[PDB]
Amino acid sequence: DTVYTFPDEFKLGAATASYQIEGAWDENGKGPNIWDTLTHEHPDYVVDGATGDIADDSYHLYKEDVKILKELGAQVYRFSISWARVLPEGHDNIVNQDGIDYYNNLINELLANGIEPMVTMYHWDLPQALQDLGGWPNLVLAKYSENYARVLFKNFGDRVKLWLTFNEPLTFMDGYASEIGMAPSINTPGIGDYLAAHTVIHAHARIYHLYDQEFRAEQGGKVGISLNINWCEPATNSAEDRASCENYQQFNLGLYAHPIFTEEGDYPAVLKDRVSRNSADEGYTDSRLPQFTAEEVEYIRGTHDFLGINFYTALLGKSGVEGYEPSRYRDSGVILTQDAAWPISASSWLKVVPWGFRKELNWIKNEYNNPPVFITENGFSDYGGLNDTGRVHYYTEHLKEMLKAIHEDGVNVIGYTAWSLMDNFEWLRGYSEKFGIYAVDFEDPARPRIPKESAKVLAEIMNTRKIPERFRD
Numbered sequence: 001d002t003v004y005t006f007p008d009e010f011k012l013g014a015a016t017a018s019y020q021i022e023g024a025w026d027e028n029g030k031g032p033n034i035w036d037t038l039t040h041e042h043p044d045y046v047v048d049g050a051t052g053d054i055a056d057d058s059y060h061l062y063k064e065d066v067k068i069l070k071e072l073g074a075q076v077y078r079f080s081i082s083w084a085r086v087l088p089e090g091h092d093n094i095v096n097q098d099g100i101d102y103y104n105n106l107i108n109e110l111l112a113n114g115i116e117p118m119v120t121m122y123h124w125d126l127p128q129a130l131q132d133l134g135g136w137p138n139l140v141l142a143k144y145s146e147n148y149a150r151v152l153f154k155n156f157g158d159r160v161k162l163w164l165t166f167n168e169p170l171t172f173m174d175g176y177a178s179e180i181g182m183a184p185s186i187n188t189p190g191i192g193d194y195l196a197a198h199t200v201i202h203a204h205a206r207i208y209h210l211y212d213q214e215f216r217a218e219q220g221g222k223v224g225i226s227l228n229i230n231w232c233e234p235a236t237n238s239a240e241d242r243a244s245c246e247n248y249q250q251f252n253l254g255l256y257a258h259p260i261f262t263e264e265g266d267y268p269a270v271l272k273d274r275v276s277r278n279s280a281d282e283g284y285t286d287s288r289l290p291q292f293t294a295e296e297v298e299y300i301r302g303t304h305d306f307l308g309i310n311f312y313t314a315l316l317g318k319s320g321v322e323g324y325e326p327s328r329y330r331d332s333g334v335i336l337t338q339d340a341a342w343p344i345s346a347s348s349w350l351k352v353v354p355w356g357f358r359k360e361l362n363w364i365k366n367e368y369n370n371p372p373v374f375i376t377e378n379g380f381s382d383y384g385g386l387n388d389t390g391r392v393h394y395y396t397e398h399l400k401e402m403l404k405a406i407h408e409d410g411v412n413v414i415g416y417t418a419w420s421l422m423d424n425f426e427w428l429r430g431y432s433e434k435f436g437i438y439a440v441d442f443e444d445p446a447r448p449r450i451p452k453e454s455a456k457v458l459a460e461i462m463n464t465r466k467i468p469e470r471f472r473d
C-alpha cells in the first residue's frame with residue numbers, strides 16, 4: 001500500500017481565488033478591478049450575465065470557509081488577495097486598512113484552527129487604474145507589482161510562509177488575445193499577450209528578489225508561482241507528432257518556466273525561433289516576441305523556491321500549424337484535439353485523462369531537474385448535485401496518478417490543494433459550472449456551504465493519509 005500512501009510531510013488542502021468567492025466588490029474602500037469592469041460593462045461575455053458582486057460572500061463569511069476547511073481536515077488553504085481591496089488605486093500611495101484587516105482576520109482564523117495559509121498575490125483581478133495604463137502589456141506594471149508585494153510581505157509575512165506571485169499567466173495573458181474573452185477583453189493576439197507574459201515574468205522576478213532582500217531572513221517562507229499546463233499526447237507515435245507535443249509544452253509551460261526554472265533562463269529556443277521566423281515571414285521589422293537582455297536573463301533565472309502547478313486535463317497533438325495569424329496557438333506549431341473517448345465534464349475544455357497528470361509530472365521532472373512541485377489546483381466540473389460521483393472519481397484517479405509519480409517515478413511533489421473548496425464564480429461561465437467540493441446555494445442570501453460526496457471522500461483521504469481500498473485498481 002506504499003504507492004497509495006501520502007508522504008508524511010506532504011500537505012493536503014483546498015483552494016479558492018478572491019474574485020471568485022469574496023463579493024463585497026465595492027465595500028469599505030475596495031477599488032474596482034478588471035473583473036468588476038467586465039461583468040458590469042460586458043454581461044454579454046458571461047453566462048447568465050453573472051457577476052462576482054456577491055459570489056460566495058467570503059468577505060463576510062470567511063469564518064464559514066474556515067469551518068468547512070476544518071471539517072475537511074485541510075492542512076493548507078490556498079486563497080488569493082484582491083489587489084484593489086488592499087491598494088484601491090493600484091499604486092501603493094493608499095493602503096486600505098479594511099483590506100489589511102480582512103486578510104489578517106482570515107489568516108488569524110486559519111492559524112487558530114490549525115490550517116496553514118498559502119497566498120496567491122495575483123489571481124486575475126488587476127486594479128482598473130492599472131489596466132488604464134495598458135495593463136500587463138505595459139512593463140511599468142512590474143514595479144507596481146513589486147510595490148504591491150511589499151505591502152503583502154510587510155503586513156502578512158510574519159504569518160504566511162507560502163506565497164505564489166501569479167496564478168496562470170498562460171491563461172490571463174489571453175485577456176489580451178480576444179475582444180470577448182477573459183478580462184480585460186482586448187484583441188491583441190500574438191502581440192499583446194506576449195507583452196503581458198514578459199511583464200509578468202519581470203514582475204515575478206522583482207517580487208522574488210524583493211523577498212530575498214527585504215523579508216526572507218526574518219520571515220523564512222517560500223515564494224513560487226502557479227503555472228497551468230495540459231498534458232499533450234502525441235496523436236500517433238511518430239517523431240513528428242512527438243515534436244508537436246514538445247512544442248506545446250514549451251509554448252504553454254516553457255514560456256514561463258524556462259526563464260525561471262532552468263539554469264540557462266530565457267524563453268525556450270523553439271519559442272524565440274518560431275516567433276522570429278513567423279514575424280519575418282509576415283513582414284514585421286521586429287519579432288513579435290519581446291526579448292530579455294543577458295542581464296535580465298540572469299536576474300530572472302533562479303527566482304523560485306518551488307513550482308506551483310495547476311493541472312486539469314490533456315489534449316492530443318499532431319504535427320502541423322493552425323490558428324489565426326498572428327496568435328500564440330499558430331506560432332506554437334501543433335494541431336490540438338480531444339479524444340472523443342475521454343470522459344467529459346461540464347466544461348468544454350476539461351476531459352478526464354488522469355494518466356496525463358503522471359506524464360506531465362514526469363515531463364516537468366525531466367525538464368526542470370525535479371523541482372519541488374506543489375499542485376495548487378486540480379478539480380472537475382459538473383452542473384450541480386451533491387452525489388458527485390464524477391468528481392469523486394476524478395479526484396481518486398488523479399491522486400492515484402500523482403502518488404505513482406511520487407513513489408514510482410521519484411517526482412518531488414510536496415503538496416496538493418483541490419480546486420475548489422466551494423462552488424464559486426467560474427469566470428466567463430458565471431455560476432453555471434460547478435467546481436466545488438462544497439455546494440453553495442447562490443439564490444440563498446446566506447450562501448450556505450454544504451458538503452458533496454467529494455468533500456466526504458477527500459476528508460477521508462486527508463484523515464487516513466491514503467487512497468481508500470475501494471478506489472484502488
Ligand SMILES: O=C1O[C@H](CO)[C@@H](O)[C@H](O)[C@H]1O
Nearest residue numbers: 017167168228310377419426
Ligand atoms: O486554473 C484554474 O481553473 C479553475 C477552473 O476553470 C478556475 O476557476 C481557477 O480560477 C483557475 O486558476
Ligand SMILES: [Cl-]
Nearest residue numbers: 235236237238
Ligand atoms: Cl501510432
Ligand SMILES: [Cl-]
Nearest residue numbers: 468469470471
Ligand atoms: Cl471498503
Ligand code: NA
Nearest residue numbers: 095151154155
Ligand atoms: Na502598509
